Design a protein around this ligand. Structure first.
Ligand SMILES: COc1ccc([C@@H]2CNC(=O)C2)cc1OC1CCCC1
Ligand SMILES: [As]
Ligand SMILES: [Mn+2]
Ligand SMILES: [Zn+2]
Length: 344
C-alpha cells in the first residue's frame, strides 16, 4: 500500500521505472531510496514479496508485512555510512536475483526462499557502525552477553526475530510451528555465516561441494539433501553481501565511499576513546584503491569464481564486471603509468 510509504503519484511513477530492474543485477537501489522517502528495504522487500507471491503463499497480510518491515528498517542506523537499510535492501535484492539464477531453478522450496530473503533483510539490523573487535575491546555489554563470538551477527538475529513481537509485526504468524522452526534454523545459519571470520571456512566448503556437483540434463543443479541446500543458501547470502564490486562501477564506487566513510568514523571513535586506530580506519593513511584491489583478489574474486563455477555459466557477466572493476581500481592507484583509467 503506497499510502503507508507516503509516496505521491509522481514519485510512484519514478519508482515504477526503477523497479523495472527488480529481477536484474543492474537495479539502482540508491534511486529506489530516493523515491521512497528513504525506505528502500521496505519498498524493495514489498516488491520482492509481491513478485514472488510470498505474501499469498505464507498468508502474510500487506498490513503485517509493511508494519514489520518499516519497524525493522527503522532499527537500521541511518547515521551509519555503510551498514544501514540501503545496504540491507541491496543484499535482499541481490539475493532475490541469485535465487532466480537458471542453474538453481526449482531447487529451493518456498520456505527456503522466504528464509534467504528474510535473512538478507535482517542480517545487519541495529549495526552500530563499528566492528566486533571494537565492541570486544571497549568491553561492550553486547560483547559480554555474546562472549565475544559473532557479536553483531548474533545481535542482528536477536533483533530481527524480537521485532516480530511488536504490534502487528508477526509476519510468521500463519506458518506452522514446524515451518517456523525450520525457517528460524536456516535464517540463523545464513546470518551467522555473514561473519567475515567464517569466510575462508565457507569458501572451502563451497569449493569442496563444487568438486562433487550433481547436475541434471538441463544443467540444473541437483540438491536433494538439506545440508547441501543450506550450504548453497548461506554462501548465496554471503555472495550478495560481498556483491558490491560485481555491480556497475557507478554503484560500486558509492559502496566504496560508504564503507570507507564508516571505517573512518570508527577510526574517529577509537581516537576519541584513546584507543589505537585500526587498519584502514585512518583517513590520512588509507589507500582506498589498493584496498579494493586486495579485497577483490583475496576475498571477493575467489568467492565469486567458485560460485560462478557452481552455477556456470550464469554468473559469467558478474565475473567479467568484477574483473573490469578490479582493473579500474588497479589503474586508479596513484603512480600507475599503464592505461590509467580502465585495465591492465
Ligand atoms: C566496497 O568495499 C567493501 C564493501 C563491504 C565490505 C564488508 C563486507 N561485509 C560487510 O558487511 C562489510 C568491505 C569492503 O571493502 C573492504 C576492503 C577495503 C575496506 C574494507
Ligand atoms: As515501494
Ligand atoms: Mn555485517
Ligand atoms: Zn551486510
Amino acid at each position: 500500500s503506497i499510502s503507508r510509504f507516503g509516496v505521491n503519484t509522481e514519485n510512484e511513477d519514478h519508482l515504477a521505472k526503477e523497479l523495472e530492474d527488480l529481477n536484474k543485477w543492474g537495479l539502482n537501489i540508491f534511486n529506489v531510496a530516493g523515491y521512497s522517502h528513504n525506505r528502500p528495504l521496505t519498498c524493495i522487500m514489498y516488491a520482492i514479496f509481491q513478485e514472488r507471491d510470498l505474501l499469498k503463499t505464507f498468508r502474510i497480510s500487506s498490513d503485517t508485512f509493511i508494519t514489520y518491515m518499516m519497524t525493522l528498517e527503522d532499527h537500521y542506523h541511518s547515521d551509519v555510512a555503510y551498514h544501514n537499510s540501503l545496504h540491507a535492501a541491496d543484499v535482499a535484492q541481490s539475493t532475490h536475483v541469485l535465487l532466480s539464477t537458471p542453474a538453481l531453478d526449482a531447487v529451493f522450496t518456498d520456505l527456503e526462499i522466504l528464509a534467504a530473503i528474510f535473512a538478507a533483510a535482517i542480517h545487519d539490523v541495529d549495526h552500530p557502525g563499528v566492528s566486533n573487535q571494537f565492541l570486544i575491546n571497549t568491553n561492550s555489554e553486547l560483547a559480554l552477553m555474546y562472549n565475544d563470538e559473532s557479536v553483531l551477527e548474533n545481535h542482528h538475529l536477536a533483533v530481527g526475530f524480537k521485532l516480530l513481537q511488536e504490534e502487528h509485526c508477526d509476519i510468521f504468524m500463519n506458518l506452522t510451528k514446524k515451518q517456523r522452526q525450520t525457517l528460524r534454523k536456516m535464517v540463523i545459519d545464513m546470518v551467522l555465516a555473514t561473519d567475515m571470520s567464517k569466510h575462508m571456512s565457507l569458501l572451502a566448503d563451497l569449493k569442496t561441494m563444487v568438486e562433487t556437483k550433481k547436475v541434471t540434463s538441463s544443467g540444473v543443479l541437483l540438491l536433494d539433501n538439506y545440508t547441501d541446500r543450506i550450504q548453497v543458501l548461506r554462501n548465496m547470502v554471503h555472495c550478495a553481501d560481498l556483491s558490491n564490486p560485481t555491480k556497475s562501477l557507478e554503484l560500486y564506487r558509492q559502496w566504496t565511499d560508504r564503507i570507507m566513510e564508516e571505517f573512518f568514523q570508527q577510526g574517529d571513535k577509537e581516537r576519541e576513546r584513546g584507543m589505537e586506530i585500526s587498519p584502514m580506519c585512518d583517513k590520512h593513511t588509507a589507500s582506498v584503491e589498493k584496498s579494493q584491489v586486495g579485497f577483490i583478489d583475496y576475498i571477493v574474486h575467489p568467492l565469486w569464481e567458485t560460485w560462478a563455477d557452481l552455477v556456470q555459466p550464469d554468473a559469467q557477466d558478474i565475473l567479467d564486471t568484477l574483473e573490469d572493476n578490479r582493473n579500474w581500481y588497479q589503474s586508479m592507484i596513484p603512480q600507475a603509468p599503464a592505461p590509467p583509467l580502465d585495465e591492465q
